[PDB]
Assembly symmetry: none
Homo-oligomer: 105 residues x 4
Amino acid sequence: VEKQAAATLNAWMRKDTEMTSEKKVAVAAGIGPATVNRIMKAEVSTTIGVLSSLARAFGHEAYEMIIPVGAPGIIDYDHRMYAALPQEEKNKITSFINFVFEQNK
Amino acid sequence: VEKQAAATLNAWMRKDTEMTSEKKVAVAAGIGPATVNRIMKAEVSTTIGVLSSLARAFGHEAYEMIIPVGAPGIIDYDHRMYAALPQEEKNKITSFINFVFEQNK
Amino acid sequence: VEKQAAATLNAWMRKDTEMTSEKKVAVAAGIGPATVNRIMKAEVSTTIGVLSSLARAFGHEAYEMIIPVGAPGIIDYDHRMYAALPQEEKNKITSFINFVFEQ
Amino acid sequence: VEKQAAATLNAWMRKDTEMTSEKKVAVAAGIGPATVNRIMKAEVSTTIGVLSSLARAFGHEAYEMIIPVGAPGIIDYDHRMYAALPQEEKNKITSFINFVFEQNK
């Protein structure tokens, strides 16, 4: 979980135009230069708030960083395209998903 | 985020799929009974460590408790129950998503 | 082919408001000489005009008479509620079905 | 509603599956030659015999012609595609049956 957050945070750090900097991530996130480090070494178990501040600096949200590899549970798509659709169309997907689910129960 | 954590905790309490009662949540998480409330009211920004332990106490992962459910770009569905599907059933769900999209785009 | 549709007429005529006399069904049809007995025997190939006036009193539309007995293309369902369920959410059905066409 | 079968036949001119270029019309049923003038509408009150042998030729049957397209209480689907395509997958639609949760239900 911490160790997920570490890799995610490092992987984004190895990518991104700001290059890599515990300083720049601290600067972008608005937390101290020494806390990033403690988080990136998976030494301290950080707060969700601080997690949020971190994901946002890269253009992401907190949960995204604490997702288990393989990502069981997650689906492939373009989010605007999904968000841009009528509400009545959405409950089609919710109705379908759980149909499948409880078909198996 | 903390407000997402609180919303889903109660949302997960509204569920009662595995849960015998309201009370036992603290030792399942194995942290003080003040803590569960402080989280449920978004008084404190909880560490991802405890967040794992609260979530693992129910049978979900941490990320599901701070997922921005409501976000229009994000389909509300149960990630554990999708994870459990035979990939044939998963491909079919994916197959529908594109269906709607390409119907609407 | 045209015959079992007569057996449906004879099946229905046994329960409605007018479950006995041929003539009350003839005026339910609105037309026809003493002939309208002939539709019961599959002697005549009854016109699609007859179904209508016949139907409006029944509460049955016309397809239910000319449906092949073993029709594979027919869905099993309670039309207790279908269009009766909201149209926002009846839209799901049509989309699922069409979804299966593309498959 | 009742003359729906007359338009439904006129609606079939987009099919073009058997014969790709300009040709006679359709000699399959052994129905009238004037039927071409007729087919569209303003026709004849057709027999059951008529539609059944035209429908037989294309792979359709009697009842499907005269079901309403516009009526509120009719589930719109192609019975022959409900027949023809694998009915090992369409048993789901039959298991799906009412499916409706009390939201729909």
